[PDB]
Curated annotation (Swiss-Prot), chain B:
Stated family: Belongs to the GINS3/PSF3 family.
Pfam families for this protein: PSF3_N, Sld5
Species classification: Eukaryota, Fungi, Dikarya, Ascomycota, Saccharomycotina
Extra facts: Present with 2205 molecules/cell in log phase SD medium.
Protein name per the record: DNA replication complex GINS protein PSF3
Main location: nucleus
Species in which this protein is naturally found: Saccharomyces cerevisiae (strain ATCC 204508 / S288c)
Swiss-Prot record, chain C:
Cellular compartments annotated: Nucleus
PANTHER family referenced in this protein's UniProt entry, alphabetically: DNA REPLICATION COMPLEX GINS PROTEIN PSF2
Biological processes annotated in GO: DNA-templated DNA replication; double-strand break repair via break-induced replication
Keyword hit for Nucleus: yes
Keywords: DNA replication, Nucleus
Top-level taxon in the UniProt lineage: Eukaryota
Source organism of the structure: Saccharomyces cerevisiae (strain ATCC 204508 / S288c)
Protein name as catalogued: DNA replication complex GINS protein PSF2
UniProtKB/Swiss-Prot annotation, chain D:
Protein's name in the database: DNA replication complex GINS protein PSF1
Native organism taxonomy: Eukaryota, Fungi, Dikarya, Ascomycota, Saccharomycotina
Organism: Saccharomyces cerevisiae (strain ATCC 204508 / S288c)
Entry's family note: Belongs to the GINS1/PSF1 family.
Subunit-level organization: Component of the GINS complex which is a heterotetramer of SLD5, PSF1, PSF2 and PSF3. Interacts with PSF2.
Effect of R84G: In PSF1-1; temperature-sensitive mutant. Defective in DNA replication. Impaired chromatin binding of CDC45
From Swiss-Prot, chain E:
Full-protein positions shown: 18 to 330 of 971
Misc note: Present with 35100 molecules/cell in log phase SD medium. Early fractionation of eukaryotic MCM proteins yielded a variety of dimeric, trimeric and tetrameric complexes with unclear biological significance. The MCM2-7 hexamer is the proposed physiological active complex.
Function as written in the Swiss-Prot or TrEMBL entry: Acts as a component of the MCM2-7 complex (MCM complex) which is the putative replicative helicase essential for 'once per cell cycle' DNA replication initiation and elongation in eukaryotic cells. The active ATPase sites in the MCM2-7 ring are formed through the interaction surfaces of two neighboring subunits such that a critical structure of a conserved arginine finger motif is provided in trans relative to the ATP-binding site of the Walker A box of the adjacent subunit. The six ATPase active sites, however, are likely to contribute differentially to the complex helicase activity.
Name of the protein in its database record: DNA replication licensing factor MCM3
Family: Belongs to the MCM family.
Subcellular location: Nucleus
Species, as recorded: Saccharomyces cerevisiae (strain ATCC 204508 / S288c)
Amino acid sequence: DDDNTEIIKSFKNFILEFRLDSQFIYRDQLRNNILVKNYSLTVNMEHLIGYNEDIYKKLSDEPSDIIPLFETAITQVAKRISILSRNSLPTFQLILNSNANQIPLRDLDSEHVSKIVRLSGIIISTSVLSSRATYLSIMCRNCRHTTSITINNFTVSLPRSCNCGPDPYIIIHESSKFIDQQFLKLQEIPELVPVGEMPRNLTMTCDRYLTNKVIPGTRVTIVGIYSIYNSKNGVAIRTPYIKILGIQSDVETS
Amino acid sequence: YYDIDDVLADGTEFPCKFQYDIPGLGYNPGRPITKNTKLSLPLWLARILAIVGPVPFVELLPPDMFSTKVMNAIKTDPVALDLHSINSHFFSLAIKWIMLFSEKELANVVSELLLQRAQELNHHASSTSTFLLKLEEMEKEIYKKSHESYKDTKRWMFK
Amino acid sequence: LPAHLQQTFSPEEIQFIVENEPIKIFPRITWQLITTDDKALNNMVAMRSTEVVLWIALLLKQQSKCSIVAPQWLTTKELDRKIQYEKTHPDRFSELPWNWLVLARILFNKAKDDFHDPIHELRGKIQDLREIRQIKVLKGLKYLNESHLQLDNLSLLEINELRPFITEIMDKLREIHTASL
Amino acid sequence: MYGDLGNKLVLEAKRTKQLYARSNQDVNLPMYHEDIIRNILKEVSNLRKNTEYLKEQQQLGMLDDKVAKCQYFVTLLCMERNKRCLLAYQRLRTDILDSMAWNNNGLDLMSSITFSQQDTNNLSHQEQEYLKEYCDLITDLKSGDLVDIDLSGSLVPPSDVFIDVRVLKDAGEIQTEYGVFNLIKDSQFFVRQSDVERLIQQGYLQKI
Amino acid sequence: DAVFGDRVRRFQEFLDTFTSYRDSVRSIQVYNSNNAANYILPHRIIISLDDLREFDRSFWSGILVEPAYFIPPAEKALTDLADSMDDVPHPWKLSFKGSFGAHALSPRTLTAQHLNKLVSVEGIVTKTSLVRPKLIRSVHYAAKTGRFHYRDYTDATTTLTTRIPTPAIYPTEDTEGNKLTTEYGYSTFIDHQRITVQEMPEMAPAGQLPRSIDVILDDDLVDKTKPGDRVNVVGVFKSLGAGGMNQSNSNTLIGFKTLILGNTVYPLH
């Protein structure tokens, strides 16, 4: 994966060299974020597209295969800032909020699936937190293979190879690093465009530092990727959800 | 003294019981106050009553704030401990009570706690969240001063 | 009544101070003036370097009647040996002009076109050397005790930013400890 | 309950420091409390009255009892307490005040102390006599130097040394000193730092 | 795993210098023998966290940060000390008083930074799932070959640490082909229960719905609390179950349900 090296080098070069005249907005965004122990970063796409058109050309192409190489790309930077040597430092979440063009809820039909979509709606109720996993160790029921699986985002079955089989892998919960998740569910705004019909509600998964960021009932504008999950209820009929990166409430709202 | 923090620090109530009887109660129709009565007194008057006597006028019963449970709990996680809830004055206050009773043991304790807050307060010295709410008033004032030096030095950094 | 700050210096005041340091210049010009504290100069010769105080170089640079020289310590190839020497002694802060932050702000506002390869380079370098050095100060600040500290070689600006903090909680810390014996 | 009104008073003193702190500093102190301190003074008069009464009573009835001492000790402290409040408040009030008399008078050509200090009559006249006597006190310092000063101004160093001032609804032209800048709303003067220091404090100039 | 041995030899020293706990263990060993001489007490020794900091901070920070590697060697050490007591004629339990906290949290604020770390929840308990047996030690009798045969069943909540699951049923004819009858009443059953905990109703921020998490109560702790009671639970915060990642079924983001094991359950008012 020299290509991922090529992409991550461009992301480092985007964080370290970026200049708004003359402070480095991101690089200081980083420091001032690790000190308060926020462990997050908010990219402003306009600066991004200003810097290179290219990396935004790919980031609006296949977001879910790229964005995590951006996460690892930035946490590899906080290693050189927040500490120095010659731990532990979670891979930061990035929250990107940008103008673009508002795409109303009714107008989401396929065709933009896995392409970043900014939109606007009133949140109905927030689902109770539950943890997904980030880094979990796994041992085999027989050969006892000790495997540290780095699970990324954005479901993923466990590897069967070190009889043995079919799936002899146990989750060690004593060493496993966990994050959080939310599930907002948002009803589009009553002004537009209900017409004569009840307004649809797309299910959204916030995670890590955006979680509990928003009280249910407050208007917001979400950004996030658009994507689909299975959830047996045929055929095939997969149902739609919006991953959120990252959320920004309306003015102010505090 | 003239600063508001000290004169406010003296305002705090302590559980100090009387060694002696004192008719002419100024607090109501006793008239005298029976010996070994436990009456809460602010620090300002109670401060020199423990000196002047060769038996002092008051026992100086250790304040609930200094309860060994607390002085133990502050040795675990100071950074997450809420000072502003208990008194709220601590350093302005505790500084007087360590001299008044001449206790060595806890010096080494509070001298540690205040480093541990500060290694955290140089962290919010960089430009809150919830944490700013749980500082002790005087400590808080130092946070203003630091945050202002930083803010001003940043505003000078560019244009 | 100075109001602000007052016990610490103002960020501006340390520039007000550093501008009193002399540095070399390249005058375009070929009265007197005695002024007071300058001592200089016989009429400056064009295409000839000479040593003068800073605030006048800056003054004559606004009129672009003189081209300031770059300091030998302000270079990216030079800074490289300095961050190299800094990563490798996590304890000591190395060797600093002591003004380097404030000269790094000042000489970049106007003089920027005089430097060889000023663009997007040195600012990237000193914004870095002003990073690892700052965190090294915050991790060297855990060892606080009364009464001593080695702050070794440290910038005037770096002193000024953290001054109220250190010299305040030293005055809460040493205050119990002196008084408990 | 005994000396607590002073704790409440200084508690109130604190909020003016809060208003001078971040802040932003416009002055505008709410008022000087004459009433509450009158309560304090009636309370303390009560105290010292019972004090001299009991001071008469030891001469007759108490006959130098060991207990008597306490009243002259403890209650005495209370007097001090009120003092500890009364001055702590008061000095605070002089600190918020004299500084104001510093940064602006006000300033060229002062030329008189007027229209300044929005508190005006709402603040006590006892302080205002002190105040006028104090700016009268600083006029002599103005008269020793021969700097020239301009001590009142230029807390922040000149750069460099010409600036640009954008008019802010001021008329004008009142710039008689040095020259007739001919103040005119919506007019920026490419003027040196000299007359800028003096005129910016008044409220005419806006952008430095 | 010589380090697990280190944890045991380390926790040994803590006891008997100072000896302030040992007298309580002795008291537990004596009282039951007094009931043996008569004509009930749960075997667990409450450990105040208070005392742990005086000896080692290194071992103190561990019990909070990574309780899976620490509580069980300390426990095996406590049994080991209970057997050196007097005399002949069980796993026990730790308690952990505290000296809270960090880790102080109400259930509303929790997950995940607080996961796999000791926790003291507090809130209302509902609805209090009904008390039920749970099998642990398998015990059997071979004949005529005799001897005495036993299997040891490891559940999801066994010890603390995760282990290759033993369950279920019975071995039946362990080699050689001898018959094995289940011996009931020698074999050990630890009672088991779970009770969910809602955050305090009065500290609820808004019309936002309450978030409750479930606490499994091992051994003695069972039936110690009726529902609707103010409770401060303690325990290790455990995430059990696959998130669905184990097998194909089912399809959905939802996963890794979490609960708290043990531990103390100090009621309050």
